[PDB]
C-alpha cells in the first residue's frame, strides 16, 4: 500500500488528553533568571538587575502573572506560550534566510548507486508523499517519549491503549512512564507556506492540493504526485517527470523569482502584492499550496563547508524559502531538508526526516536501473511563468544584491573530534550533552576571555500545544570549570577538575529536566512582556534592563539532533557577533558544525573547541593538562 507505517494506535490518539503546559511560580522564575545572570554580570550590574527583579516580582510582574494565569484558565485547550511564540516569529521583519531557517542533511543511501540524483530524488519524493499519506490515514505511530521502551513501546501496550478513549489515553501512557507528545504542528509539514504580509506574516495551508513543486536552475515546475483517487502516482511516472525536469537545458532566468523569499518581510510583502497586481495570484497559489518544494541542484558537494552553505542558503535562485520545507537533492545525491522555522518547533520535521530516510533506503520505490514510465511529461509537468514588471525586476535585482553581500560575510566550518564520545562520557557518569556545552563555554573563554549569553533549546511537547523552553547552559559551574581549565590549569588536581565537570553535568541535567517540564524562565518572562504589550502597557523596566537585552542576545546559539538519518545540520548565528553551533555527540566521536559572520571567527573557535575537548578527555582519563 501507500503507507510507510501501520499504527494500530491512531496517530492523534493522545492529543485530547495531553497535560496543560504549566506556568511556573513567579518566585521560581525570578530566581532562575538571576541564576542564569550570575555568570554574565559584574557585581554592580547584578545588583541593579536583582533590584529590578524585586520591583517586578512584587509589583507589575505580580500583576501581569495574575492575568497570565487567568488567561490560561480561560484557554485550557492550548498553552500560554503557543500564540505569543508564533506571533514573535511571524511579526519578525528580518530575512528568514540565515536568521531563522536551518537545515538537516541526510546520510547517503548506504547502497552506492541509489545516490544517483534521479533515483534518490524519486525515492525521497515518493517516501515523503508516503509520509503524508500515513499521517492523513492516522497510520503514523504517535510521537511518544518513553522512559522504558521495553515495556511501553511494545505491541502489548499498543494493543491495549487503542481501546482507551482519547479523553483518557494520555493517562494510560503516563502510568507506564511514557510521555506522548503534541502533534498539532505535523499537518503544516505539507501543502503549507509562509505568506509575507505587512506587520505580520500568514501561515497558509491547502490540503486539497495534489502537486509537487520542483525548482531547478531557478525555474519552477509542478506535477501531480497524488492521482484523482488520492493514490500516489506510479513511482516510474514520477521518475519520468523528474528526468524530464533534469533534462531541461534552459539557463538560469535573468531574474530568478526565488530571490524574493530571502528579502526583508515588509519588502517581500510589497513585492508579492505587485505580483498579485500583475496577474500572478494563480501561479503563486500553485507554489504556495504544493505538497512541498523539491530543489534539484546541478552540482556535486565539494566538501562539508560547501555542503553546509548549499543546504543553509545556496545561491539564492533555487530554494523557495517560505515553504514549510525544501527537500534538496544535489548531483551526487546529497540530500537535506531546509525548513521554515516559524510554523513549528521542528519535531515534526525530524520525525518526517527519520521516516523518510528509513523508507527511502530500506523500501525504495525505484532502483538505479529502473526504466521511467513511457509517459508524456510535457503534458503532466507545468513549467510555471511569472509576469514580471519593471518594478519586480528591480526588486529581484535588489534581493540578489542583499543576498550575495550577506552570504559573503558567512563562514562555516566543522570538526570531528575522534578521541571519544557518548560511551566514554557515560562511563564517567557524565551527561554527554553537558560536556559538549561545557566545551563551548570553555572554548569561548579561551578565544574571547568572556562568559556570554548561551542558548540551548528543549522541547516542551509533552504538553498540549507545547513548544520549546530555553536551557541556559552558561552556569556558575561551567564558568568556574572553564576558568580552571583555561586561566590556571596547573592550579587543580585531576580529581578537582573531574568533580567540577560532574557539577556542570548535574546542574545541566537539572536545567534540562526543568526546561522539559516548562520550568525554565525564558518563556514565562516572555509571555509576561507579550501580555503587557498586548494590553497596551508601557514595557516594564525589567525588560529595558541591559542585562535582559544581553540575556536575549545569544552569542552562543546551540542545537543538537540525535539520529542515524542525519549526517550533519547547520544554522547561521542568531546575532551579528554570534556563533551558530550545530553539534552531535556520537558513540565514539563528537561533531560540531559552526557558523559565524565577520565579527566572529568560527575556524579559531573550532581549534579552541578541539583543544577544550582534548583537555576535558585528558582530565577524565587521569592525565594532567
Method: X-ray
Q: Provide CB contacts within 8 A for 268, sequence distance 6+.
A: 196, 260, 261
Contacts 24+ apart (CB under 8 A), 526-529: 526/81, 526/84, 526/85, 526/88, 527/23, 527/68, 527/80, 527/81, 527/84, 528/61, 528/64, 528/65, 528/68
Q: Is 203 left (phi over 0), alpha (psi -120 to 50) or beta?
A: beta
Pick out the residues of the known binding site for (R)-carnitine: 455, 457, 468
Helix (H, G, I), strand (E, B), or coil: what is residue 184? coil
Q: What is the full DSSP assignment across 217-274?
A: TTEEEEEESB-TTSPBP-HHHHHHHHHHHHT--PPPPSS-GGGGGGS-HHHHHHHHHH
| DSSP H or E stretch at residue 180 | strand 178-180
Grid cell 503549507 is found at: 192
Residue from 593, 475, 568, 594 nearest 107 by CA = 568
Number of alpha carbons in the 13 Å side-chain half-sphere of residue 526: 19
Domains and CATH numbers, the chain: 10-19+142-180 (1.20.1280.180), 20-99+411-563+574-625 (3.30.559.10), 100-141+181-410+564-573 (3.30.559.70)
| DSSP H or E stretch at residue 48 | helix 43-58
Q: How does strand 325-329 pair with strand 566-570?
A: unpaired
Q: How does strand 219-224 pair with strand 579-585?
A: unpaired
Task: Identify whether 341 is a catalytic site residue.
Answer: yes
Q: Provide CB contacts within 8 A for 104, sequence distance 6+.
A: 336, 337, 349, 350, 353, 561, 566, 568, 569
- Candidate list 146, 306, 341, 553, residue with the active-site label: 341
Interior angle at CA 512, CA 510 and CA 518, nearest 5: 105
C-alpha cell of residue 601: 571567527
Q: How many residues appear in the chain?
A: 625
> 269 and 196 in contact (C-beta within 8 Å)?
yes
C-alpha cell of residue 108: 547517503
Number of alpha carbons in the 13 Å side-chain half-sphere of residue 350: 16
Q: Provide CB contacts within 8 A for 64, sequence distance 6+.
A: 528, 531, 532, 540
Annotated resolution, angstroms: 2.0
Alpha helices in 313-382 (DSSP H): 347-362, 377-380
Residue from 265, 300, 257, 252 nearest 116 by CA = 300
Grid cell 551558530 is found at: 580
Amino acid at each position: 500500500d501507500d503507507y510507510l507505517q501501520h499504527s494500530i494506535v491512531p496517530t492523534m490518539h493522545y492529543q485530547d488528553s495531553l497535560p496543560r503546559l504549566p506556568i511556573p511560580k513567579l518566585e521560581d522564575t525570578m530566581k532562575r533568571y538571576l541564576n542564569a545572570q550570575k555568570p554574565l554580570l559584574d557585581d554592580s550590574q547584578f545588583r541593579r538587575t536583582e533590584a529590578l527583579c524585586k520591583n517586578f516580582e512584587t509589583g507589575v510582574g505580580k500583576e501581569l502573572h495574575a492575568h497570565l494565569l487567568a488567561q490560561d484558565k480561560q484557554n485550557k485547550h492550548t498553552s500560554y506560550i503557543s500564540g505569543p511564540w508564533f506571533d514573535m516569529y511571524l511579526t519578525a521583519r528580518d530575512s528568514i534566510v540565515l536568521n531563522f531557517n536551518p537545515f538537516m542533511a541526510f546520510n547517503p543511501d548506504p547502497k552506492s548507486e541509489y545516490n544517483d540524483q534521479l533515483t534518490r530524488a524519486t525515492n525521497l519524493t515518493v517516501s515523503a508523499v508516503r509520509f503524508l499519506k500515513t499521517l492523513q490515514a492516522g497510520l503514523l505511530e504517535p510521537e511518544v517519549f518513553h522512559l522504558n521502551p521495553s515495556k511501553s513501546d511494545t505491541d502489548a501496550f499498543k494493543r491495549l491503549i487503542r481501546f482507551v478513549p482519547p479523553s483518557l489515553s494520555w493517562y494510560g501512557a503516563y502510568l507506564v512512564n511514557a510521555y506522548p507528545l503534541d502533534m498539532s504542528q505535523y499537518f503544516r509539514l505539507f501543502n503549507s507556506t509562509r505568506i509575507p504580509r505587512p506587520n505580520r506574516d500568514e501561515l497558509f495551508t491547502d490540503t486539497k492540493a495534489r502537486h509537487l513543486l520542483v525548482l531547478r536552475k531557478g525555474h519552477f515546475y509542478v506535477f501531480d504526485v497524488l492521482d484523482q483517487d488520492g493514490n500516489i502516482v506510479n513511482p516510474l511516472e514520477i521518475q519520468a517527470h523528474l528526468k524530464y525536469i533534469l533534462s531541461d537545458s534552459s539557463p538560469v532566468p535573468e531574474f530568478p523569482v526565488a530571490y524574493l523569499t530571502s528579502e526583508n518581510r515588509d519588502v517581500w510583502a510589497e513585492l508579492r502584492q505587485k505580483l498579485i497586481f500583475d496577474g500572478n495570484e494563480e501561479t503563486l497559489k500553485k507554489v504556495d499550496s504544493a505538497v512541498f518544494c523539491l530543489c534539484l541542484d546541478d552540482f556535486p558537494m565539494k566538501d562539508l563547508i560547501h555542503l553546509s552553505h548549499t543546504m543553509l542558503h545556496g545561491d539564492g535562485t533555487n530554494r523557495w524559502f517560505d515553504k514549510s520545507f525544501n527537500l534538496i537533492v544535489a548531483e551526487d545525491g546529497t540530500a537535506a531538508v531546509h525548513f521554515e522555522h516559524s510554523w513549528g518547533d521542528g519535531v515534526a520535521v525530524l520525525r518526517f526526516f527519520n521516516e523518510v530516510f528509513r523508507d527511502s533506503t530500506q523500501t525504495p520505490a525505484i532502483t538505479p536501473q529502473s526504466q521511467p514510465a513511457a509517459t508524456n511529461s510535457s503534458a503532466s509537468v507545468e513549467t510555471l511563468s511569472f509576469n514580471l514588471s519593471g518594478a519586480l525586476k528591480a526588486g529581484i535585482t535588489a534581493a540578489k544584491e542583499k543576498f550575495d553581500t550577506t552570504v559573503k560575510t558567512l563562514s562555516i566550518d566543522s570538526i570531528q573530534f575522534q578521541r571519544g564520545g557518548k560511551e566514554f562520557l557515560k562511563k564517567k557518569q557524565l551527561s554527554p550533552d553537558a560536556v559538549a556545552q561545557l566545551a563551548f563555554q570553555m572554548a569561548f573563554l579561551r578565544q574571547y576571555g568572556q562568559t556570554v549569553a548561551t542558548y540551548e533549546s528543549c522541547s516542551t511537547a509533552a504538553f498540549k500545544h507545547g513548544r520549546t523552553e530555553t536551557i541556559r547552559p552558561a552556569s556558575i559551574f561551567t564558568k568556574r570549570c572553564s576558568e580552571a581549565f583555561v586561566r590556571d590549569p596547573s592550579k587543580h588536581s585531576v580529581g578537582e577538575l573531574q568533580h567540577m565537570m560532574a557539577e556542570c553535568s548535574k546542574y545541566h541535567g537539572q536545567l534540562t529536566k526543568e526546561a522539559a517540564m516548562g520550568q525554565g524562565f525564558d518563556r514565562h518572562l516572555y509571555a509576561l512582556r507579550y501580555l503587557a504589550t498586548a494590553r497596551g502597557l508601557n514595557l516594564p523596566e525589567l525588560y529595558l534592563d541591559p542585562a535582559y537585552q544581553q540575556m536575549n542576545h545569544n552569542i552562543l546559539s546551540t542545537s543538537t539532533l540525535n539520529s542515524p538519518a542525519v549526517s550533519l545540520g547547520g544554522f547561521a548565528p542568531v546575532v551579528p557577533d554570534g556563533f551558530g553551533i550545530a553539534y552531535a555527540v556520537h558513540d565514539d566521536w563528537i561533531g560540531c558544525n559552526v557558523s559565524s559572520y565577520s565579527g566572529r571567527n568560527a575556524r579559531e573557535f573550532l581549534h579552541c573547541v578541539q583543544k577544550c575537548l582534548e583537555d576535558i578527555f585528558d582530565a577524565l582519563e587521569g592525565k594532567a593538562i
